[PDB]
Design a protein around this ligand. Sequence first.
Ligand SMILES: [Zn+2]
Ligand SMILES: [Zn+2]
Lengths: 203, 214
Amino acid sequence: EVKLEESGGGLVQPGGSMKLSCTASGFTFSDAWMDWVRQSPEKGLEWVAEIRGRFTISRDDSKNIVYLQMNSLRPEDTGIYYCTSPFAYWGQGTLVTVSAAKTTAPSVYPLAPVCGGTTGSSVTLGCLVKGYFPEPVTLTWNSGSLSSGVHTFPALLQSGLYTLSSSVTVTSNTWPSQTITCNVAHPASSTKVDKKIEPRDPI
Amino acid sequence: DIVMTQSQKFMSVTVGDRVSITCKTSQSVGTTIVWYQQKPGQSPKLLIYSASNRHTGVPDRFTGSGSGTDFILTINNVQSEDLADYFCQQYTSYPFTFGSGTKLEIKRADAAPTVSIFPPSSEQLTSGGASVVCFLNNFYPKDINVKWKIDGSERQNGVLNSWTDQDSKDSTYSMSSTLTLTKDEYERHNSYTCEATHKTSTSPIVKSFNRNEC
Ligand SMILES: [Zn+2]
Ligand SMILES: [Zn+2]
């Protein structure tokens, strides 16, 4: 069977360099076409040759290894880089993150409903997690006891820092009698925050 | 380089139906077309090559057709395990460019979004920031438009919209829209509005607040 396996990914700063490796087995290495394709939400699937100087493919003198040397990297080069022997054989993909951010803890803000009093049958609360790096953060409600009616939204890059939010919806006769708390944890900064959601008051 | 266009980014299907995914090449490529299937967290997987030649192990429900510039991947009797992104690719000219992708989704009855708006928290205002958040939850179909207004005028910059994946239980979508402002900007203007336009209503759904009110 054919096996391709990438390595050498991770974090790197803008203008920096990184060399990816891909070890191959199950065929005669020099008889095979070996290439690199990257995937991002913005650009989709791209052959490294489409990005063009900055991305150069080479091979090991003896071993079954193909390399991808990446230079002068930019934030837009962030994505998953696949080793491939076209068309059927692909590695697992390795994540390359290009960013100048230092490790930064999230600011966690509770989002209670409008002060006026939206009331109605149901009530929706929120929890805003802003300005953290790197990914990921884990967000739960009431130690994970409240899972129904929850929408945690994927993080987006805002400036050079990540921001995400989460909504939770419950019947109007629960909150604020039943306490509701979003629990946010960020392993990289060693921070675990619990923010209770409380009704707004006049300024 | 040759441009491969898949006009549909999302398609909704019912299990048992037939679906046709289109691919268009910017140049004549004969029948040098490959189709891939990609599930989340996995590499693309080869389905068809030479436009219509099915790869080993692929169910015969998958059929590729077309020649020249217009190609079609047809999935007959669609099953739940066919939910995935589908990509076309040409190999008449290197780089062997990929299409933009088409995700298969579940069809359901139309459902209006539940909209709720949230002014900046007290604690954020003390830290010197001001974000206005709008949740639009549990709607179908996916197509939706959100407009932010400040004292009646539309506001375009500083807006980030984040979609959830389709829900595995009720097949709906949810969206988060965040208007980021400076504190001094938030404290100058009065009215803040979140307007949602969706096919379930002729009129847009409007949620708003005034900064000084309660
Ligand atoms: Zn060969
Ligand atoms: Zn061949």
